[PDB]
Design a protein around this ligand. Sequence first.
Ligand SMILES: CC(C)(C)n1nc(-c2ccc3nc(OC4CCC4)ccc3c2)c(C(N)=O)c1N
Length: 460
Amino acid sequence: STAIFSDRYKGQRVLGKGSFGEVILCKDKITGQECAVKVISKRQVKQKTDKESLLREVQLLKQLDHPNIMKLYEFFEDKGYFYLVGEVYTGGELFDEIISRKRFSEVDAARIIRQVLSGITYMHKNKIVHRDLKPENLLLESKSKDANIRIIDFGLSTHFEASKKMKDKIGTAYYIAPEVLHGTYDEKCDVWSTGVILYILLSGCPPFNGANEYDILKKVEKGKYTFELPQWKKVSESAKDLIRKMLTYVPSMRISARDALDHEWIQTYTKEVPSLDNAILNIRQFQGTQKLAQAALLYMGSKLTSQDETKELTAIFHKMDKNGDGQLDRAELIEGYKELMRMKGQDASMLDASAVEHEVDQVLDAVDFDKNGYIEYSEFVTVAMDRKTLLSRERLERAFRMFDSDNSGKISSTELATIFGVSDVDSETWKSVLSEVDKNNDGEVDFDEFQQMLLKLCGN
Ligand SMILES: CC(C)(C)n1nc(-c2ccc3nc(OC4CCC4)ccc3c2)c(C(N)=O)c1N
């Protein structure tokens, strides 16, 4: 009796999308314990190692315990998926909390960074390297002000090939250690990344920056950065010294996570100082830019997914309609939706037959439909897809409002440049699209215009 994931857990809702897959909030069917399950599709993510190697790693990770590292509880594998069952954390990304503060200082930075260093040190002792460490991988344990930081995804880079899709790689270039690019790397790459995160926490700007991904990688590969911005005047030599040691090019010369923990700056500023307002302002801008480019690409993706699935669902139902009537019953809509799921394999939310049944019922409950006298498939398809798109279009509007910090309703041509640079959409291409939406415009777009540009950039 091999164990099966859905015999034990039922999905409650989606928490979001991370590296390698979807994260679902799940519940144990017997104990009622809540857990965050990372679902990695074997069809979308290629393994780098053999099965042996990964199971060994999973066994080790289940035995490791540290207050700043996500806790893994269980592991399931079936034909199409791996299921990584872990502790649920409700505090969100670090940077999302930081932008909401009214005050931020070198003491707060230092408390953050020594939580990070402490989880890393621990993991390196057990010979586990993160490699893809960045702000998105730092969650707060709870919505409390005093909440601990938990590092997610320690261990996945060793076993899974990262996505080349830009919707997944957005914002990774700032943090990656030069030696990781060239291919010969060890645990010190995690110190580099942390050194970058500290630079951003104290100034609000990345030390290596650029108008697009490859521009950013060129800076990193040269390894040159400076403290020649005005806001570094507000920051102790001590912190700059730690940064220097963490951003040391040659790894053998770069400080270890453990020796970073014993550095003067950490010692001084994590004991019981000016607010860094410019830093917090730059971070609020940097964060907004990223989340808007991210949401742009996920909107484009959602629209493309939708077209794929509308045509597919329509063809499944046309075929299933042996009458030629355009009328299916509940049990068929379900059979068809399920067969969409067999063919795609994209919904972590539809983890079992019962998750599908309920989704169908939510759709039937939406349309003005007698549910126990059979339904017009055309209209079920419309409501079902919109429902899918909803999360992504609502998020787009929200990331747009949050980016528009002065509530002007508009974003300048200069701001778009930065947004499409980060989203790695060719410059000539988006200017060309901006020309065709509003052919009278004056280098600013509202939300409706911006959205039309995106629809045009994904083939519509
Ligand atoms: C914010 C979002 C990205 C939606 N997220 N993601 C997780 C999360 C992250 C990494 C995980 N890794 C797991 O296993 C690790 C063992 C190597 C990967 C298992 C569950 C995870 C949940 C997570 C959580 N655990 O609460 C959460 N809130």
